[PDB]
Amino acid sequence: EKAKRHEAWITLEKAYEDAETVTGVINGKVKGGFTVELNGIRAFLPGSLVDVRPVRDTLHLEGKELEFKVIKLDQKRNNVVVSRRAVIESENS
């Protein structure tokens, strides 16, 4: 029942409404952005608060297994994004 979740996502809408918390790991990495699998859904992390003024090892950018903070979803593109400031938690709760 993997595809069935597609229609079940309709219930998640009410969840994000109250800023529901999620949890997933980064599967794909793009130029500045970062794709993460959250319950089957694909998230997007802003690079604005990811890569900047490197001082130490930055290999944690990919493969990081941490939670995120939903601030606003874009159903228009049948996709969901992640907050930038929320990175404060993803970095190291």
Short mmCIF file of N, CA and C in Angstrom, two decimals:
data_model
loop_
_atom_site.label_atom_id
_atom_site.label_comp_id
_atom_site.label_asym_id
_atom_site.label_seq_id
_atom_site.Cartn_x
_atom_site.Cartn_y
_atom_site.Cartn_z
N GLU A 1 0.83 -1.20 0.00
CA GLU A 1 0.00 0.00 0.00
C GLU A 1 0.87 1.26 0.00
N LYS A 2 1.72 1.38 -1.01
CA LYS A 2 2.60 2.53 -1.13
C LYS A 2 1.93 3.66 -1.91
N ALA A 3 1.32 3.31 -3.04
CA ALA A 3 0.64 4.29 -3.87
C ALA A 3 -0.65 4.77 -3.21
N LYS A 4 -1.26 3.90 -2.42
CA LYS A 4 -2.50 4.24 -1.72
C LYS A 4 -2.30 5.46 -0.83
N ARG A 5 -1.07 5.67 -0.39
CA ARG A 5 -0.75 6.80 0.48
C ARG A 5 -0.95 8.13 -0.26
N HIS A 6 -0.84 8.08 -1.58
CA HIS A 6 -1.01 9.27 -2.41
C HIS A 6 -2.32 9.98 -2.07
N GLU A 7 -3.40 9.21 -2.01
CA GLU A 7 -4.71 9.77 -1.70
C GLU A 7 -4.88 9.98 -0.20
N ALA A 8 -4.15 9.19 0.58
CA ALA A 8 -4.21 9.30 2.04
C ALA A 8 -3.54 10.57 2.53
N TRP A 9 -2.67 11.13 1.69
CA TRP A 9 -1.96 12.36 2.04
C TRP A 9 -2.94 13.49 2.35
N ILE A 10 -4.15 13.37 1.82
CA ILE A 10 -5.18 14.38 2.04
C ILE A 10 -5.40 14.63 3.53
N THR A 11 -5.10 13.62 4.34
CA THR A 11 -5.27 13.74 5.79
C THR A 11 -4.12 14.52 6.41
N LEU A 12 -2.96 14.47 5.77
CA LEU A 12 -1.78 15.18 6.26
C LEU A 12 -2.01 16.69 6.24
N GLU A 13 -2.86 17.14 5.33
CA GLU A 13 -3.17 18.56 5.20
C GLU A 13 -3.56 19.15 6.55
N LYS A 14 -4.49 18.49 7.23
CA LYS A 14 -4.96 18.95 8.54
C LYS A 14 -3.82 18.92 9.56
N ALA A 15 -2.84 18.06 9.32
CA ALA A 15 -1.70 17.94 10.22
C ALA A 15 -0.79 19.16 10.12
N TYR A 16 -0.34 19.46 8.91
CA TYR A 16 0.54 20.60 8.68
C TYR A 16 -0.10 21.89 9.16
N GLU A 17 -1.43 21.91 9.18
CA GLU A 17 -2.17 23.09 9.62
C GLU A 17 -1.70 23.55 11.00
N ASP A 18 -1.45 22.59 11.88
CA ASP A 18 -0.99 22.89 13.23
C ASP A 18 0.53 22.73 13.33
N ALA A 19 1.20 22.79 12.19
CA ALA A 19 2.65 22.66 12.16
C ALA A 19 3.09 21.30 12.69
N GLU A 20 2.58 20.24 12.08
CA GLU A 20 2.92 18.88 12.50
C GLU A 20 4.40 18.60 12.25
N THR A 21 5.01 17.84 13.17
CA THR A 21 6.42 17.50 13.05
C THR A 21 6.61 16.24 12.21
N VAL A 22 7.69 16.22 11.43
CA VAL A 22 7.99 15.08 10.58
C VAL A 22 9.36 14.49 10.90
N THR A 23 9.74 13.45 10.17
CA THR A 23 11.03 12.79 10.39
C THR A 23 11.44 11.98 9.16
N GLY A 24 12.58 12.34 8.58
CA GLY A 24 13.06 11.63 7.41
C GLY A 24 14.55 11.84 7.17
N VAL A 25 15.10 11.11 6.22
CA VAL A 25 16.52 11.22 5.90
C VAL A 25 16.73 11.74 4.48
N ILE A 26 17.78 12.53 4.29
CA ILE A 26 18.09 13.09 2.98
C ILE A 26 18.49 12.00 2.00
N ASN A 27 17.71 11.85 0.94
CA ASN A 27 17.98 10.84 -0.08
C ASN A 27 18.71 11.45 -1.27
N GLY A 28 18.26 12.63 -1.70
CA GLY A 28 18.89 13.30 -2.82
C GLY A 28 19.40 14.68 -2.46
N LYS A 29 20.49 15.10 -3.11
CA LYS A 29 21.08 16.40 -2.85
C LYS A 29 21.19 17.21 -4.13
N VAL A 30 20.63 18.42 -4.12
CA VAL A 30 20.66 19.30 -5.28
C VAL A 30 21.49 20.54 -5.01
N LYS A 31 21.65 21.38 -6.03
CA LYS A 31 22.42 22.61 -5.89
C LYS A 31 21.78 23.54 -4.86
N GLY A 32 22.26 23.46 -3.62
CA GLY A 32 21.73 24.30 -2.57
C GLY A 32 20.58 23.65 -1.83
N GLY A 33 19.76 22.90 -2.56
CA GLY A 33 18.62 22.23 -1.96
C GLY A 33 18.96 20.84 -1.47
N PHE A 34 18.01 20.21 -0.78
CA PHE A 34 18.21 18.86 -0.26
C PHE A 34 16.89 18.12 -0.15
N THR A 35 16.78 17.01 -0.87
CA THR A 35 15.56 16.20 -0.86
C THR A 35 15.57 15.22 0.31
N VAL A 36 14.43 15.11 0.99
CA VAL A 36 14.31 14.21 2.13
C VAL A 36 13.00 13.44 2.07
N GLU A 37 13.06 12.14 2.38
CA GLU A 37 11.88 11.29 2.36
C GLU A 37 11.17 11.32 3.71
N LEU A 38 9.96 11.88 3.73
CA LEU A 38 9.18 11.97 4.96
C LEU A 38 7.84 11.25 4.80
N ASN A 39 7.78 10.01 5.25
CA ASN A 39 6.56 9.22 5.16
C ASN A 39 6.17 8.99 3.71
N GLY A 40 7.15 9.03 2.82
CA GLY A 40 6.89 8.83 1.41
C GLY A 40 6.91 10.12 0.62
N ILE A 41 6.68 11.24 1.31
CA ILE A 41 6.67 12.54 0.66
C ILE A 41 8.09 13.09 0.52
N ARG A 42 8.29 13.92 -0.50
CA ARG A 42 9.60 14.52 -0.75
C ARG A 42 9.66 15.94 -0.22
N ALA A 43 10.64 16.21 0.64
CA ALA A 43 10.81 17.53 1.23
C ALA A 43 11.92 18.30 0.53
N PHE A 44 12.05 19.58 0.86
CA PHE A 44 13.08 20.43 0.27
C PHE A 44 13.64 21.40 1.29
N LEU A 45 14.94 21.28 1.57
CA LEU A 45 15.60 22.15 2.53
C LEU A 45 16.37 23.26 1.82
N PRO A 46 16.14 24.51 2.26
CA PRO A 46 16.80 25.68 1.68
C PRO A 46 18.29 25.73 2.02
N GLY A 47 19.11 25.98 1.01
CA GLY A 47 20.55 26.05 1.21
C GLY A 47 20.97 27.34 1.90
N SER A 48 20.05 28.29 1.99
CA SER A 48 20.34 29.57 2.62
C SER A 48 20.97 29.37 3.99
N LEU A 49 20.56 28.31 4.68
CA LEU A 49 21.09 28.01 6.01
C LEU A 49 21.69 26.61 6.04
N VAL A 50 22.37 26.23 4.97
CA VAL A 50 23.00 24.91 4.88
C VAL A 50 24.49 25.03 4.62
N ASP A 51 24.85 25.68 3.51
CA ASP A 51 26.25 25.86 3.15
C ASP A 51 26.62 27.34 3.14
N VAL A 52 27.55 27.72 4.01
CA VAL A 52 27.99 29.10 4.10
C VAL A 52 29.16 29.25 5.06
N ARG A 53 30.26 29.80 4.57
CA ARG A 53 31.46 29.99 5.39
C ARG A 53 31.88 28.68 6.05
N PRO A 54 32.42 27.76 5.25
CA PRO A 54 32.88 26.46 5.73
C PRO A 54 34.12 26.56 6.61
N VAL A 55 34.09 25.89 7.76
CA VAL A 55 35.21 25.91 8.69
C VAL A 55 35.67 24.49 9.03
N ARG A 56 34.71 23.58 9.16
CA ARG A 56 35.01 22.20 9.48
C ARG A 56 34.37 21.25 8.48
N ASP A 57 34.52 19.95 8.71
CA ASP A 57 33.96 18.94 7.82
C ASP A 57 32.47 19.19 7.60
N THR A 58 32.05 19.14 6.33
CA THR A 58 30.65 19.37 5.98
C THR A 58 30.08 18.18 5.21
N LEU A 59 30.41 16.98 5.67
CA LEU A 59 29.93 15.76 5.02
C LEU A 59 28.55 15.37 5.55
N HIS A 60 28.14 16.02 6.63
CA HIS A 60 26.84 15.74 7.24
C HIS A 60 25.71 16.29 6.38
N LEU A 61 26.07 17.06 5.35
CA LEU A 61 25.09 17.65 4.45
C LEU A 61 24.25 16.57 3.78
N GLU A 62 24.86 15.41 3.55
CA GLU A 62 24.17 14.29 2.92
C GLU A 62 24.21 13.05 3.80
N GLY A 63 23.07 12.38 3.92
CA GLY A 63 22.99 11.19 4.74
C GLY A 63 22.56 11.48 6.16
N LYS A 64 22.30 12.76 6.45
CA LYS A 64 21.88 13.17 7.78
C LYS A 64 20.48 12.65 8.10
N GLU A 65 20.34 11.98 9.24
CA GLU A 65 19.06 11.43 9.66
C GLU A 65 18.50 12.21 10.84
N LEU A 66 17.77 13.28 10.55
CA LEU A 66 17.17 14.11 11.59
C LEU A 66 15.76 14.54 11.21
N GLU A 67 15.02 15.05 12.18
CA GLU A 67 13.65 15.50 11.95
C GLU A 67 13.63 16.90 11.35
N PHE A 68 12.45 17.37 10.97
CA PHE A 68 12.30 18.69 10.38
C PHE A 68 11.13 19.44 11.02
N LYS A 69 10.89 20.66 10.56
CA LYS A 69 9.80 21.48 11.08
C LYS A 69 8.96 22.05 9.95
N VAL A 70 7.74 21.54 9.80
CA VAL A 70 6.83 22.00 8.76
C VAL A 70 6.33 23.41 9.05
N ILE A 71 6.50 24.30 8.08
CA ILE A 71 6.06 25.68 8.24
C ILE A 71 5.01 26.05 7.19
N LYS A 72 5.10 25.42 6.02
CA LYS A 72 4.16 25.68 4.94
C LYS A 72 4.37 24.69 3.80
N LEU A 73 3.27 24.12 3.31
CA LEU A 73 3.34 23.16 2.21
C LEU A 73 2.76 23.76 0.93
N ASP A 74 3.30 23.34 -0.21
CA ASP A 74 2.84 23.83 -1.50
C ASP A 74 2.13 22.72 -2.28
N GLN A 75 0.82 22.61 -2.07
CA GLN A 75 0.02 21.60 -2.75
C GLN A 75 -0.05 21.88 -4.25
N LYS A 76 0.15 23.14 -4.62
CA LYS A 76 0.10 23.54 -6.02
C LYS A 76 1.01 22.66 -6.87
N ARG A 77 2.20 22.38 -6.37
CA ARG A 77 3.16 21.54 -7.08
C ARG A 77 3.15 20.12 -6.54
N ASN A 78 2.02 19.72 -5.95
CA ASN A 78 1.88 18.39 -5.39
C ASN A 78 3.15 17.96 -4.66
N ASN A 79 3.76 18.91 -3.96
CA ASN A 79 4.98 18.64 -3.21
C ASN A 79 5.00 19.42 -1.90
N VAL A 80 5.95 19.08 -1.03
CA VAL A 80 6.08 19.74 0.26
C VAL A 80 7.51 20.22 0.49
N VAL A 81 7.64 21.37 1.15
CA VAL A 81 8.95 21.94 1.43
C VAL A 81 9.20 22.02 2.93
N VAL A 82 10.43 22.37 3.31
CA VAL A 82 10.80 22.48 4.71
C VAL A 82 11.25 23.90 5.05
N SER A 83 11.07 24.29 6.31
CA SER A 83 11.46 25.62 6.76
C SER A 83 12.98 25.76 6.80
N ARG A 84 13.46 26.99 6.68
CA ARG A 84 14.89 27.26 6.70
C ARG A 84 15.40 27.36 8.13
N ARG A 85 14.78 28.24 8.92
CA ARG A 85 15.18 28.43 10.31
C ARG A 85 15.10 27.12 11.08
N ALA A 86 14.23 26.22 10.63
CA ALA A 86 14.05 24.93 11.28
C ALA A 86 15.36 24.13 11.27
N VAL A 87 16.26 24.51 10.38
CA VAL A 87 17.55 23.83 10.26
C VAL A 87 18.25 23.75 11.62
N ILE A 88 17.98 24.73 12.47
CA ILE A 88 18.58 24.77 13.80
C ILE A 88 18.40 23.44 14.53
N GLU A 89 17.31 22.75 14.23
CA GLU A 89 17.02 21.47 14.86
C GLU A 89 17.66 20.33 14.07
N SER A 90 17.49 20.35 12.75
CA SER A 90 18.04 19.32 11.89
C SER A 90 19.55 19.20 12.08
N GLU A 91 20.21 20.35 12.21
CA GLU A 91 21.66 20.38 12.39
C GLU A 91 22.08 19.47 13.54
N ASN A 92 21.41 19.61 14.68
CA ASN A 92 21.71 18.80 15.85
C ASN A 92 20.75 19.11 16.99
N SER A 93 19.60 18.44 16.99
CA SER A 93 18.59 18.64 18.03
C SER A 93 19.21 18.54 19.42
#
